[PDB]
Amino acid sequence: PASRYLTDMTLEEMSRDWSMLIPKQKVAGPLCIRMDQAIMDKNIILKANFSVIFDRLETLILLRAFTEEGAIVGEISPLPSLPGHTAEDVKNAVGVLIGGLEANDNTVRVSETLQRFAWRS
């Protein structure tokens, strides 16, 4: 107490508005997954912001999928009910998005922060 945040996004990236040409949305536990169904054939990078506590990545604040050119085409966010999630919830929601984008022929990569979070639980 209190918490800090490690993030892959500039302050602009996590504040910017975005919308989906073809809006797809799915609830996975306490988290909302959105991805633009229209996006295809792109190289995508998943970037997250995590609360950091006791030097441990603690909880997902925001995840977004960016194309190589910086466009937001996917989002993972907790429900405003503020239902608290677990690291498995997160890893689960994340694979759902990955699968969603690879359906459309997008090559998906994850950030170093997520690469590390995968194995930290």
* Domain regions of the chain by residue span: 1-121
Q: How many helices (H) and strands (E) does the chain have?
A: 2, 7
Count the Cβ atoms, other than its own, within 10 Å of residue 121.
11
Please report the resolution in angstroms. Answer: 2.5
Using CA of residue 6, residue 37, residue 72, residue 18, what is the dihedral sign? negative
**DSSP string of 25-62, one letter each residue:** EEEETTEEEEEETT--S-EEEEEEEEEEETTEEEEEEE
* Two tokens, residue 35: 């991805």
Beta bridge pairs of residue 66: 45, 72
Element (H, E) at 66: strand 56-67
Q: Which of 110, 111, 69, 114 is nearest to 90 (CA)?
A: 114
Fold of 1-121: Nucleotidyltransferase; domain 5 (3.30.420)
